[PDB]
Design a protein around this nucleic acid. Structure first.
Lengths: 48, 143, 50, 100, 116, 111
RNA sequence: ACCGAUAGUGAACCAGUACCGUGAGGGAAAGGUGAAAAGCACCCCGGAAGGGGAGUGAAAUAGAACCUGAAACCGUGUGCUUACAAGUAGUCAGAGCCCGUUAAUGGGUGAUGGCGUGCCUUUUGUAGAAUGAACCGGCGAGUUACGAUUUGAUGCAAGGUU
RNA sequence: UAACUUGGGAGUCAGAACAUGGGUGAUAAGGUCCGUGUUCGAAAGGGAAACAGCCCAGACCACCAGCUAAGGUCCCAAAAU
RNA sequence: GACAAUGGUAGGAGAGCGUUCUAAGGGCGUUGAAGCAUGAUCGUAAGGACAUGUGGAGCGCUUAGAAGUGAGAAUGCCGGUG
């Protein structure tokens, strides 16, 4: 029924949001680390 | 929680007199300090005064050991630039024997607000006669 | 020089303990019936005795 | 008179008609309880010693089975983004002594 | 859709300011200063719950020492004598007996001396 | 029973008025009038009209006698601020606050 | 399954306007009484502004500076405490003095005793005399499109899919 | 009571003190460069007066219970004048 | 019921709270909604109720869906006030 809906078991998962407080585990640096070329906006080196 | 706490509604204080003739200065001062605080009672409470009053007569003929008569020196500073004073313990005995005993005992008490009040119950006299006969002081022997 | 710290409201009010004004110093005129300053003339009928 | 009883980890000093607070027991509210371990009895009657007094039980009745006030546990470390928060309510058992 | 603030930021900030009543000056008024002091209060209380047990054991032992000296013996020899007999009464109960029942304590000092 | 009068939006700084209000707080009505007439401050005549208006309210609106009256309450509250500027040196301007106050006086017969 | 007056066009309002520049050019802030103006006749203090009554209205602490009306900050009155004392201002213990709850081993204040050098960032290492914040409020930072790969679910199966 | 293999996701490439085996310096440095252990980093609690790196010892929570380690027992300050 | 584990920065993994809008079902409201204020209340945390004042017209609950979805700090921007 439209008021009792249920997706299949294990078929959905919630996305992870970074930069939303220290308790989440991805708060300040958002998983990037400390002060490098790979910690800047725009990324780093070419894939090869 | 069963622990008893003493307070001013039920504190009892009494008076003692102690003879300072033929005793070492430091061995007598350590015992007097344990009495002014109240460490000899079963109702000792840390945050209230429980100890008793002490009268010290015959403040002269207090005895040192070794060469302390000339070697032990007391220093003070007047908080003015270049002013520091000095006096020998053998010289203070013959000119202010009451201060010699009084300062030694006061150095063995905590320097809190309660410590100053607990140190105001000591009376020291250089002779064998005291004027506190309105109370009923009792003779005390040193452990 | 400039202040190193902000002054709190407790310290500010302590400093203003003595900042106030006094009473004028007035007496009653026994011709006017109303108040006047000592050693000054009355302002109601403009009389000064003595 | 009075007795010393061992109610698990700790000891209590009890008289008759006195209400006491202990840690949670398996009894229900209203039923009777017995303290089988008594270490000392005094008063006018002859003083008895230790390690255990031969018999000498104490009886009491259960009044309430509740929990204590909530205390918040909080710790943190400065300059390290680490902290924790926890609540706690400790359960107790209320009793009233009636026969030593 | 656009989600704005309101009724969420104010609610949680009032909870912190309400735990700091009685504090001096701006430490019960301004949120940022009050937030710091409330964290230090929780850190202090955790430490002080465990120091409260060391503070009260010392007080009982001091009182047992004074009572025992009135019977011509020290604290250290009193606990050895009781242990050699098996009294198993802790320091909290011995202190409560010396204050209240003066001649019941003397019933325990004798047995501590009987076993030496 | 009490009577009151209010003067709103008076162009005087609030903390200059409060100095005068400290002298007449708690005095008889006849004594407060004399104090205000003999004090040589700027805000004394302004407060004089507020107390006179409140005294006349106790005689027409109500039925109270002006011989047993006292000054029960006398306080000043802040009003809107007028924002101005002052040209300083080197091409800079400094702000100036022209402040305003609300003045209230209550006179009570007692009871 | 777009915004709801710091948003949405710079501009919901006499806005490319006030204003700024020789000029090209740059550019704001400002919405809300009430269902109905029925927008306070009349009396009192004053030169006036402002107010106290009396009336209108369901309501005037809805009176045009008008729906609701938070915080910083400024004042008035009161229960407990403070003028011999060395304070990151709290925490644990604790007399005395006042109150009475979402009724429960209750609330307010605090004579004294023990312990105790803010937060963030950056560092081998910070109470640091290394950086940043005067206070309060609003706003302010891993998203979407198209491809690749891997994991879970579902349908069919030597076939699957447009 | 771990180890090896195949896949998805990382951070790290400025380290410091103590003891010990050596080079360099001057058998100087809280110096500098290597080998071998510990602790800090990323570790609260007790001792060394105070004192990241020294000695003891690894905090899930509550209790006004007991036994110990380092270090201590005349007074401050708990326990042998 | 018996035993065992539970300090932690960079970083990996898991389970949840709350906010605005949509769908379906079921409800509350002038005999007084949201918002605001106070309170000695409940849960392990994010947080949720109730009572009383003010307020004068909208708003919750259950299961799903989608995001302009959470602020203490950038010599941050705008307004008010020391």
């Amino acid at each position: 029924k439209l008021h009792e809906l249920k997706p299949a078991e294990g078929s959905r998962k919630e996305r992870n949001r970074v930069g939303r407080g220290v308790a989440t585990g991805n708060g300040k640096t958002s998983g990037r680390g400390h002060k490098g070329q790979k910690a800047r906006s725009g990324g780093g080196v070419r894939p090869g | 929680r069963q622990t008893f706490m003493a307070n001013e509604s039920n504190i009892e204080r009494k008076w003692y007199v102690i003879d300072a003739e033929g005793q070492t200065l430091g061995r007598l001062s350590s015992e007097v300090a344990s009495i002014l605080r109240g460490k000899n009672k079963v109702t000792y409470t840390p945050h209230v005064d429980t100890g008793d009053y002490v009268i010290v007569i015959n403040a002269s003929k207090i005895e040192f050991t070794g060469n302390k008569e000339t070697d032990k020196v007391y220093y003070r500073h007047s908080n003015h630039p270049g002013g520091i004073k000095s006096i020998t313990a053998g010289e203070l005995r013959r000119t202010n024997p009451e201060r010699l005993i009084e300062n030694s005992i006061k150095g063995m008490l905590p320097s809190t607000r309660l410590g100053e009040k607990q140190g105001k119950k000591l009376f020291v006299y250089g002779g064998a006669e005291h004027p506190h006969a309105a109370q009923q002081p009792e003779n005390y022997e040193l452990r | 020089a400039v202040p190193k710290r902000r002054t709190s409201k407790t310290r500010k009010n302590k400093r203003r303990t003595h900042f106030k004004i006094s009473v004028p110093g007035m007496t009653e005129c026994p011709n006017c019936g109303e108040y006047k300053l000592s050693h000054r003339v009355c302002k109601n009928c403009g009389s000064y005795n003595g | 008179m009075f007795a010393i009883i061992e109610t698990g980890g700790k000891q209590i000093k009890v008289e008759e008609g006195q209400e006491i607070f202990v840690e949670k027991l398996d009894v229900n509210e209203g039923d009777t309880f017995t303290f089988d371990k008594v270490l000392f009895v005094g008063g006018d009657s002859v003083k008895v010693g230790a390690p255990t007094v031969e018999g000498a039980t104490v009886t009491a009745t259960v009044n309430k089975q509740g929990r204590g006030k909530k205390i918040t546990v909080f710790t943190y470390k400065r300059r390290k983004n680490s902290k924790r928060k926890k609540g706690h309510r400790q359960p107790y058992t209320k009793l009233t002594i009636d026969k030593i | 859709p656009r989600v704005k603030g309101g009724t969420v930021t104010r609610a949680r900030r009032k909870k912190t300011i309400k735990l700091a009543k009685g504090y001096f000056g701006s430490k019960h008024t301004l949120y940022k200063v009050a937030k710091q002091q409330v964290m230090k209060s929780g850190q202090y209380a955790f430490r002080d719950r465990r120091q409260r047990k060391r503070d009260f054991r010392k007080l009982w032992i001091t009182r047992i020492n004074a009572a025992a000296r009135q019977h011509e013996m020290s604290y250290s020899r009193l606990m050895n004598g009781l242990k050699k007999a098996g009294i198993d009464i802790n320091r909290k109960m011995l202190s409560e007996i010396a204050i209240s029942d003066e001649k019941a304590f003397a019933q325990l000092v004798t047995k501590a001396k009987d076993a030496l | 029973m009490e009577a009151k009068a209010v003067a709103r939006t008076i162009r005087i700084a609030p903390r200059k008025v409060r100095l005068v209000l400290d002298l007449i707080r708690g005095k008889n009505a006849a004594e407060a009038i004399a104090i205000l007439k003999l004090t040589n401050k700027a805000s004394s005549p302004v407060i004089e009209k507020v107390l006179m208006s409140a005294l006349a309210n106790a005689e027409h609106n109500y039925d109270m006698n002006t011989d047993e009256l006292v000054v029960k309450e006398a306080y000043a509250n802040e009003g809107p601020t007028l924002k101005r500027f002052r040209p300083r040196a080197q091409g800079r301007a400094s702000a100036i606050n022209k402040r305003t106050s609300h003045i209230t006086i209550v006179v009570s017969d007692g009871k």
